[PDB]
Amino acid sequence: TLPPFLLDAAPCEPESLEINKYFVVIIYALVFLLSLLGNSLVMLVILYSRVGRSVTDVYLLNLALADLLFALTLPIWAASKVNGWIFGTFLCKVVSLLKEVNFYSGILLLACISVDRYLAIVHATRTLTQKRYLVKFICLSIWGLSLLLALPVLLFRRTVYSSNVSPACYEDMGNNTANWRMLLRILPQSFGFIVPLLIMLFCYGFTLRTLFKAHMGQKHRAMRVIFAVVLIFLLCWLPYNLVLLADTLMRTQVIQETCERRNHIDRALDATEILGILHSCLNPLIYAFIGQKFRHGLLKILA
Amino acid sequence: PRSAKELRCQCIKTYSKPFHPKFIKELRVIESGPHCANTEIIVKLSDGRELCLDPKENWVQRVVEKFLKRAEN
């Protein structure tokens, strides 16, 4: 008849804050507005004149559409972050499908642009360069692959009502949902980070190697642009994937699990999601408006 | 009530030393679901400290049943 006492076997209760909520709302609204304006301007510049529509123009059009759809979906995500998912199951499914489809499409389009530049520079004089005039079919295939890879979100998502937390547009795959979610996370980290990252690194490394050996007067600017693109992609996507892998390891008990680490991982996940959302706004500047053609077009249109 | 994009179990480990039910005042049982793969039993102690019991261990069922029976009276 002795009190059992407490020896760290206590429920780990999550910590809630409201400043982060207001900051998240402001950041999401700013990102929404910037992405909308930039993507609309890119689309208008490309579509105003049908003269000189090259492969890069098609790629940029597809990328702009993807980013515009992502930004258009953002506001409901911001509201959900504010007060959890109150909008119902059907909207959860549809919005998640749109968001993930556009995310996959954007990443794969960046990879395709990298391959296009590799072919256009490294193999400029060879006969392989002629194989880059299949932009329409390649873009259609990328969109189809994104739609295929986004199916699990559509099929296995609904509204989950928990006790410690507000309702969430989560996945409900049964009593064993955690393991299936961990497995399904393999697709975003393989066809979303690792494969595009390797393709981009290979292509841009060889492109830089060829450029450094040339004697043109414009080598420096192209090299700086390539470095900026690669660093932007890394800064945007590496932290989120690193934190996701850390969470996956923590759940599997490969790394020790404690309340402090869980709270830190949640905070890092939120911060890294906010950080990675900036790609929809930074793509138009990095890929489209850093070129003379688009700037001249923008100047001409305003006449 | 906050919001999170990762749902986790509420108990990391469980108390293992059997103890008399007289020290229990409040009980909570959470069925397994999307949030956690195992049922969770959390009990308040006499002094206010909270504990996580093992849902499948033998003595836990006895203790929970005795507490509920006594409270129901």
Added chain:
Amino acid sequence: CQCIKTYSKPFHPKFIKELRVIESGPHCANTEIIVKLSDGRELCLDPKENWVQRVVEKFLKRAEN
């Protein structure tokens, strides 16, 4: 206390996701039972009602699987 009124319409236990029991004491007079259902609603159940007692036992037995 944490409960005021209790539902008077019995419902199938299959919707009960979470259960909580608070014994009477200095804080209140009658033991309180709070159930969180699949649809997000929170209900307070009177321990003295037979249907409440049966539902609690059914939920407890199911949760032990």
